[model samples]
Every structure is written in structure tokens, then in C-alpha cells.
Target: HPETLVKVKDAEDQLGARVGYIELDLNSGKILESFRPEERFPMMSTFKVLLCGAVLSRVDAGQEQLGRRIHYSQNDLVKYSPVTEKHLTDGMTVRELCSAAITMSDNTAANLLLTTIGGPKELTAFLHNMGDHVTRLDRWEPELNEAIPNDERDTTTPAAMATTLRKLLTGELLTLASRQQLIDWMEADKVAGPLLRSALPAGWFIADKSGASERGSRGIIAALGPDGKPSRIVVIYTTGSQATMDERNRQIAEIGASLIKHW
Candidate 1:
């Protein structure tokens, strides 16, 4: 983890970007290093990680089945165009929706899962039961339209999210087979614009979820690169970078990739 810290510091200096990083060696439950790791920020779509966990929890509890189908409606739309306009009129299974939500950051898919799985209240309770204290799920407000303020969106810390992923990876959050499935979904993530994805090595097997808003972005990427070992997880959230979206993403990718190489 000390090696990770050195790389992170160098990245911060070179990119002139603020970062939050946390890595847990699963065998020991020891954090390698954390940079501004406790600071809270808008979770963006990274919040979907919790949703994915909650959905799995329901499956474990026999409260829901993964194959159940859900139909999306106009009310499920969020700010993103790719996620909003398409009416998911065909029946989609819970597992498929969870996969879509995490891998695609599909708002409609996320909302369908959220509504079916008892909404934010249940999800928050689920996370608390798993020992994450600072993370929370705040429902998307539809009535306010684009006028919704930044503070009202969901938020969390890098360490907390890392903990959430750790729990899942360690099989503390789901059955052994389900845990593998969840990781597979995360690995299938296709929305690659945020920090972690932009930063890592090409062809590295990264499993991650990304979140973005008009005001900021956040995400987590986990993989084993040059080390050829267990996946290393890095979480990042940026609120006020002066760079354009493309610039910010490029900086994040460069910084993250450098950290992996050095660490």
C-alpha cells in the first residue's frame, strides 16, 4: 500500500488533480493507503455499486429472484439522454437490470431495480447492516427537473465505497456464486468516461462503475495490472476540476495508470 501512496502523490503533483484512493489487501483486511479517502463527494453512478449489492442481498434473503422481469416507464428517466428516452418496454430480468445499471450506468435500469428492491430506504439499511457507516443512497428527485440542487444528490466516500466492494469481493455481501456474478457485471461496465476507467492500462481486466452529473463525476476501477495479482481497487470523485470533461477524464486515466505502474 505504501507503494500505492507514492504513486498517488506523484499523480496528484503531475495532474494537479485532487484524488481519493483506498486499497484493501483482501487476505488481511488491511488498507494499503488512503488519500483524502474519508472526504465525502457526490457518488454519481458509483452509487449503483450499492444498488447492485442491495439487489444481490435481496436475492440472498429470498425476498426477490434475479430472473423476475421489470418494465420501464416514462417516469424512470434521469438527466442522461442515453438512459432516459428509451422506453424499456420489453420485459427485463432483475439480473439483467442490475447488469445494465452497473455496466451501462443505465438510469432507467437503475430506477427499475431501485423501485423493485424497496427503494433508497431499504438500500441504505442494507449498506448499514454490512458495516458501511458513511455511505448513503439518496433517491433521484424527478419533480424538480433540472432545477434539483447538487446537495440533494447521493453521496459517499472513497473508503466507504471501497469497503462496499471489498465486502462483495470477500463474499461477505453475497453467496459465493453471486459474488462472482456481481464482479462479472462490474467487469462488463461499458461507461468508461470517468476517472478510474480513463486512468488504467489498456486491456487490463477492470471491473468498475462510473457516475457523472453536470457538476461532477465519480467512479471505481479494480484490476490487476503489471503485478499479475488480485484486483487493486481505486476510487475517485471530482467536483470542481477546471478542465473540460475530456481533459478531466484524460488526466484521471493518466494519473491512475501511472499509479498502477509505480505501485
Candidate 2:
């Protein structure tokens, strides 16, 4: 039997989801444990970090500045969005765009960042260059807003996301400055419920990103433990979760307590 699903499968019965999980230790470049680490999930807004990483790769080359301003046309505004929809007329800096996309999980901001950075072709290439072969981004966020199944949206495996996070944070894929900037944004993340950061011990710092819509929730939290050391890389991605939001959250809380207790 695989490692985590056995632990989480009863939750799957409660939620009616097929959950795929992974835990990696960047400190050792080892997959500490996983259940279907290679199986892909819908990848929701979690891909924003990668897209933004691509943006920073340019910054890594002296190609752009994080403080550079990006304009959002009136047309870029989405309906009733609380984040950047109101700011379309004013526009924002690249740094602000990255923050809104990652920390606030803002779709309008993410689309703006994606468009500003030469779109998906370059990002796909960037992922390939980073050694992620199976995880890929093929569509804009608007296409995902249509409430299609998880398979119809952007796709990724837990191992791919964990590998990307590990490489980026370890300075294998991004500059120290760029990597820290990502960590800063993730530290500001408005997502991550009681199951993730809220479930961890005090003094622990987590820089995390997450994705969700109708396709179910998917996310990765790469954290430094209480000692400020990179201690865990946790990826939990799910699709077709039949549980209500509350039930799913309870399941996640269980998963969190288990990890915190044992890992």
C-alpha cells in the first residue's frame, strides 16, 4: 500500500475524493513519503507561483524589475472580484501584481502577471528547463473559471510542484533575491486554512500557495520549521471531492495533525 492514502483514504470516503499527496524534504532532496506523488491534480491557482517564478527568472537575468509597473486595462477587470478588479483603472507594480496573485489568490492579478511575462509558451519551457516533465500549464485562468472538471484545467503532480519549490527555494532554479521575494509573497498568502499553517507549531514560518475553483482544492506549502530551517514540503491536491467545504476542511485538519504529530 502507498504511504499516505491509507492514512487519508477514510477521509476520501467522507469526501468522496481521490486525494494525491506528497511530502519532500529539500534539505536532503528526498521524497520523505507520498501517496500517488506522480498523479496530477487540477493545479488551480497554485500554478501562479510557477508563472511568477518565470517572471522572476527574467529578473534573475536582469531582464526586468519587480518594482516595474504593469497596467491593467478596464477590460482586464473581472466581475465583483475583491482584489484587483477595483484597481484596473489605477494599475499596479510588478511586485504588487505578484503579491496579489500569490498571497491573495487573485485571478485578475494572475492573468495580468501571465500576460506581462510573455504568456504560457515561455512558462512551459521554463518548467521543462527546471526538470518538470509531466506537469504543465496550457490555459489561461479565464478558461478555468468555466467550472469544468479538474482534468480540463491546468494540471500538475505533487512531486512536480514539490520539486519546483525545492529547487527554487534551494537556489537551484532562482536567485536568492528572487527566491526570497517568493517566500515573502507566500508568507503573505491569504489562503492556507486551519489544516496547513494554522496546524503547525509556533515559530514555524510557511510560504505557501494554493489553487481551487469547482475542480476541488490543490496546494503546496513549503515551510521552514520552528528553527527557521526548511523542514517540510507538503503537497495535497484533490479532484472530485464530493464532501462539502466544511467536511473537507475537517479531513484536512486531521491530515495536518497527523503530519505535525509524526513528521
Candidate 3:
């Protein structure tokens, strides 16, 4: 088990990039393995998971309705919005938007949801309300993925994000139905298939959101491990790499391989 950490460190070194990761028991709240747990990495689309959590929290309180349809024009669309771009005329309901945002990491869907929650600042407040001070959102989509070195904006540490996720999905933060909805959305994620998910051994299950940007910024936040029960929480992030995206993905997958082998 101790060798898991060593393998991860080797993966990080070979990645030629800054890397941070944490693996923990979802129910026990005991950390299994971690590296630079406090070091921040740009969140990119991974924030969509928490953003949807905030929205669901409101829905649980009857303060928001997922059925409410929101109309948008071409101007409202942003880069990387595969789903939103298709329904610009009739717009989409809050539920559809959340689905697109998480399942596809749709940028426009996330921005619309960000607006629904009041904006990036409000989302940061939501995190604070959950007692997560290490995670912050200072900008909307595309800009949020800037991944600037030394910039704290739009970044989260592996430990904090993992804890925030555990709270939202497995803790008391969201009602049972809302929490289940969140997990369902994550289970439908369309982004991680060719990345970390590919490296996981057969029969292991994962529900995750993946994020990417310049400087090889990539991350996957998920509940994963052998199937048949509630899995562990795993958050892995990387940045500051000059290598190609494929190379970055390879290193991440290798780290995943080491992690699952330990389990």
C-alpha cells in the first residue's frame, strides 16, 4: 500500500509536470493515499460537479425548479458547448443544462448554470458555505480554464475538492434524492472514457468529470474502484507540462493503474 504513493510520485516525475492526487474511502473519510494534497490545480470543468451540487441543493429546498426552461441565443453560446449549441433557439430546462454540463462538460451549459447560481462569486460562496475555503471560482468557463501558474483563481487542492465531493455526494449536504441525481449525472460522464477511465482495470466502476486546458491542465474527480459497492473518492490533477496532451493522459493513466493495483 505504501508503494502506491511511491508509484504515484514516479508517475508525477515522469509526467514532467506538477501533479496532485488524493484517494480516500468515501464512507470512512480516511485518506488512503495523497501527494501535494494542499497544492492547488486549476479546476477547469471539474467545478461543474460542485456547481450542479449547489443547483440541486436549491432544488431540494424548492427555491429552484429543474423544469424551468431558459432560452438563449447564439450570443449566449461559448466554445466547447456541444449540447447547448444545438438548442440555442428553444433553450433548455435547468435539468437538461445540468445534464449537459456534467455529462459532456459543456461550457455554455455550465456558464448558464453559473448564471443560475448567480455567478462565479456565488459559487465560491456556496463552497464556503460547505466549509471549503481552499476551492474557489473566480471566472466563468473558458477563462476559468486559463490555468495560469501561481494564480489561485479557479483552482482547488486535491484534498479540499475530494472532501467537498464526499460531502456533497456521500455526506448530509444534499438530500437523498438530490445526491442520487448528482451521482447519476456523474455516472453519465462522457469525457473520461479515453483518459483515466481507460486505464482502470476491467470490472472497476467510475463516475467522473474531466477537465483540460493549456499547460497540460487535466483532472478527473470521481468515485471509483471495484464495482458492487460504494466506491472510493479519487481526485487527480496535473498541470505545467510541456508534453503533448496524449502524453499527459498517458501519465495520468499510469498513475491510475498504480492506484487500482494497490486497491
Candidate 4:
């Protein structure tokens, strides 16, 4: 797959962005191909998936319940909270919040979950306890998506994120029930990358969370492979170019296109 890595680096030049990626064989923990796999990139909305994982960890320990209702008011709402904005009157259950955050990328739902997990620092602690000290969560909501160059505030390396995500999604980090529920949410993701989805050849399966912001910063973390085999883990990110989001997304999609062989 060195040739795929070469193509990905060439894509970085074509897209005028810094590209980072890692593709892993989920069952064997083998890295199939990668470029800048250890470089830092903003987590953006992708963090919500792990955010819910941290919450599910608490639920697994009997400290929390997914069915518990969390009530909130207008004052608690934030911009881009499509689902939570609609449920201001009745509020939502912990499970409902997680669904909204992952499926819809609802900002307010993610913020509420962040608060429930004791804010950004606590989430970082959760990552550390999960043996992922390289990933950090430093800000809340919109601020976290800032994607400032040279700043590592809300960033994760592709290798760390791929390993962390594999641990939570496939390993013993969460109960089987919790892991399945998280996968369900990601599978139902409404905001997943259209370009990435389109780039795959027909019938390849993917469950993913995608992110974007200023400076052409965009990323996608996914579990994908041929329909019948165990899924492979794919984490890809792009940053530092002033290219439009569409261009950046297309680049990632091209990178996705190059990944079919490793499967």
C-alpha cells in the first residue's frame, strides 16, 4: 500500500492541504496504509462519537442510565442544535441526546453530554483512562471547532484516534450492548460525508462521523470494508489550506477511493 500512501500525498498537493490518514485492519490491528498518521488534526464534530462513548462507559459502570431524561431550557440551547431546538419543551433522554448528537451533529445535544461527562477536561481524562493520552478535548461546542493552526487544543492524531475508536467500537472498552448502540448511531448518521460516501465503489459499507471548519479543515472517522468481512478502520483528516470545504471533502473522498484495495 505504499503506492496508496504515495497517491494520498499527491492528493495533498492537488488539494493544497495537509493530509493525515490511517487505515487499519480491525481484526488484526494492522495498518494498511497511512500518511501523516501521527500528525495532529482537529476532532471537530467527530468528537461527539467518542463523547457518547465516554457517557456509555459511565452507564456501563452503573453510574448512569440511558433512559434517564435530561431536561433543558431555551437558555441552554446553542446554534446548530437542530434536534434539541425542537425538543425544548419535553427535553430528551440520555440516549436520545446521544442519537441527536451523532446522527444530526446537534450542537446543544453534544454540549449537554459534555456537561454530563464533566466538561472537556473530564473527557480528556476518559481518553487517558482508556489509554489514549494523545487525544485531548479542551473546549466546548463551537469553540472546539475553531481549528487554529499550530494549536493542539482539540486535536487527535490519526493513529491515536483510529486505535481509540477501534478500542471503543470493537474491543472490551464498553459493553456489547453499548458498542452496538454506538454503531447504530453512526450507521444512522445523517451528516456523514457525501463525497466520502460517493467515492466508495458500490456496496462498500461504512459507519462514520465527519467534521469540517475554516481553513479547509475536515475529517472522517469510519469503520468500513467489503460488506461481508469484518470492517476496517479508516481515519482521514485535512487542514491548513484555504480551500473550500467541498474541495477538501473531495480530496478525502479521493483518498477513500484509493483505500478499496487494502480491504
On lDDT, the candidate that comes out on top is 3
Please provide TM-scores, in order, for all candidate models, with all chains considered together.
0.84, 0.91, 0.96, 0.95
Best-to-worst ranking by lDDT: 3, 4, 2, 1
List residue ranges in candidate 3 displaced over 4 A: none
Per residue, candidate 4 scores C-alpha lDDT tens digits across 100-135 of 999999999999999998999999999999899899
What does candidate 2 score on TM? 0.91
Which pairs in model 1 have colliding backbones? 45-211, 198-253, 199-253
Q: Give the alpha carbon lDDT tens digit for every residue of 64-110 in model 1.
A: 89988777666567655354355456767898778778877777777
List clashing residue pairs in candidate 2: none
* Cα error, candidate 1, residue 213 (Å): 2.1
lDDT of candidate 2 over 95-165, digit per residue (tens): 88888888887778877787876676677788898788766777776665333554544677888888787
**What would you estimate as the lDDT of candidate 3?**
0.88
lDDT by residue for model 3 (1-263), tens? 67767766776787777789898899998998888999989999999999999999999889899899999889988898999999977889999999999999999999999999899999999999889988999999889988888899999999999999999988888999999999999988988877768877767778889998876778989998686455799898887677777777787787777777778
lDDT score of residue 86 within candidate 3: 94
Better of 1 and 2 by TM-score: 2
lDDT score, candidate 1, position 133: 70
